[PDB]
Ligand binder design. Structure first.
Ligand SMILES: Nc1ncnc2c1ncn2[C@@H]1O[C@H](COP(=O)(O)OP(=O)(O)OP(=O)(O)O)[C@@H](O)[C@H]1O
Ligand SMILES: [Mg+2]
Length: 380
């Protein structure tokens, strides 16, 4: 039997869809597509009508490719500036009795934790067992099948204000014709591009998103910090449009097709583009475009450099993994290496520890689909 794993990644610019099939442990990419996101500046959906259709267009495209009808459970991730880390510990005392830890005991405890994390108007999207202690002072890597008299588990969780949660939940409930689970797009991205030795030794994931740049760091298998910089790709595009009387659409087209993270060695070859709201065709050079881009990019990083240090107080054995649309700008890793002074690589599903899904060559190598993959594996 082929069990289906549907996944949606709601971004401020694009909504990515993906459907994976597991059969014998035969991960395959049965369907996938991307669509222009609508109805939300970001964080908030300011036009649920426009937004709901964007999600339906995606759903149509997906169902069509599958020559089927999606009725399986969905895993939907979305981006927010309000995601944050929260911990909680849960303990059990079986008295003098020396009970053996089973999966049941572990899920009860994780459930106890989920409840506790639901407070202060926040609600957990991801939970990670951080450490295990059997009857005070015996750190184990896996408590399962071990007999203890007492057990304490510290959990790390990524939470969101239920205010934001409701917003997405309500609208998606009237669009997705099946139950689902919301997830952080930043955490899922990390889960879909990182490697175990990386999540373990220490690594920083820098998502070069649209409205902002997301920051998340892992150490010892779980995230230890998460934040962002209020500077994203949207700003690089505003910059290009400002310097060149061009429109925002034309600005993005240029960035996507001619942009480069290193301008110093480019040729001054001519590049044409339509002026602001007119046929008036104007012209720039390859180098001038990249000069405008370069500035914005140096800011984004130089600005997220304090995060690098802030976590350094708890790791670059893994360096930085760049993901998101920005990660696709040519030679951006080269710019990042100079700014962060550490090893920099591009994140995508292919360069991860994760299973080598079959028929899935383009999206698995696309940084923009990282989260889509993460959503599925950030579960089972
Ligand atoms: N191939 C590319 N080369 C360079 N820049 C690109 C490329 N593809 C996309 N971008 C840039 O990335 C932006 C989209 O970023 P991204 O794909 O991270 O957005 P998103 O997932 O919709 O947003 P969010 O960060 O809220 O999840 C575009 O506005 C564009 O400027
Ligand atoms: Mg994204």
């Amino acid at each position: 039997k082929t069990v289906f794993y549907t996944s949606i990644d709601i971004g401020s610019r694009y909504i990515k869809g993906l459907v994976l099939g597991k059969r014998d442990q035969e991960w395959e990419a049965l369907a996938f597509s991307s669509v222009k996101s609508r109805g939300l500046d970001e964080g908030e959906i300011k036009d649920a009508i426009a937004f709901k259709e964007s999600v339906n267009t995606l759903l149509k495209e997906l169902e069509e490719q599958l020559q089927k009808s999606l009725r399986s459970d969905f895993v939907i991730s979305f981006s927010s500036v309000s995601f944050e880390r929260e911990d909680t510990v849960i303990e059990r005392d079986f008295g003098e009795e020396k009970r053996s830890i089973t999966l049941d005991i572990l899920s009860e405890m994780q459930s106890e934790a989920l409840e506790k994390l639901k407070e202060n108007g926040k609600t957990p999207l991801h939970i990670f067992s951080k450490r295990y202690l059997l009857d005070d002072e015996r750190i184990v890597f896996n408590p399962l099948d071990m007999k203890a008299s007492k057990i304490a588990i510290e959990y790390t969780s990524i939470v969101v204000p239920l205010k934001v949660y409701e917003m997405f939940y309500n609208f998606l409930q009237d669009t997705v014709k099946s139950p689902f689970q919301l997830k952080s797009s930043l955490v899922s991205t990390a889960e879909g591009v990182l490697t175990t030795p990386e999540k373990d030794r220490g690594v920083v994931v820098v998502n070069l998103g649209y409205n902002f740049t997301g920051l998340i760091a892992y150490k010892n298998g779980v995230p230890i910090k998460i934040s962002y910089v209020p500077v994203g790709m949207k700003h690089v595009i505003k910059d290009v449009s400002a310097v060149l009387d061009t429109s925002f659409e034309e600005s993005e087209r240029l960035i996507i097709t001619h942009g480069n993270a290193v301008y110093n060695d480019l040729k001054e070859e001519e590049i044409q583009y339509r002026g602001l709201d007119g046929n008036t065709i104007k012209t720039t050079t390859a180098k001038k475009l990249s000069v405008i881009i370069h500035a914005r990019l140096r800011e984004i990083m130089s600005k997220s450099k304090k995060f690098f240090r802030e976590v350094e107080a708890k790791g670059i054995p893994g360096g930085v993994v760049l993901t998101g649309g920005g990660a696709k700008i040519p030679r951006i890793n080269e710019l990042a290496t100079e700014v962060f002074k550490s090893p920099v690589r591009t994140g995508c599903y292919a360069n991860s520890d994760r299973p080598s899904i079959i028929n899935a060559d383009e999206v698995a190598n696309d940084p923009s689909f990282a989260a889509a993959f993460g959503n599925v594996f950030a579960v089972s």
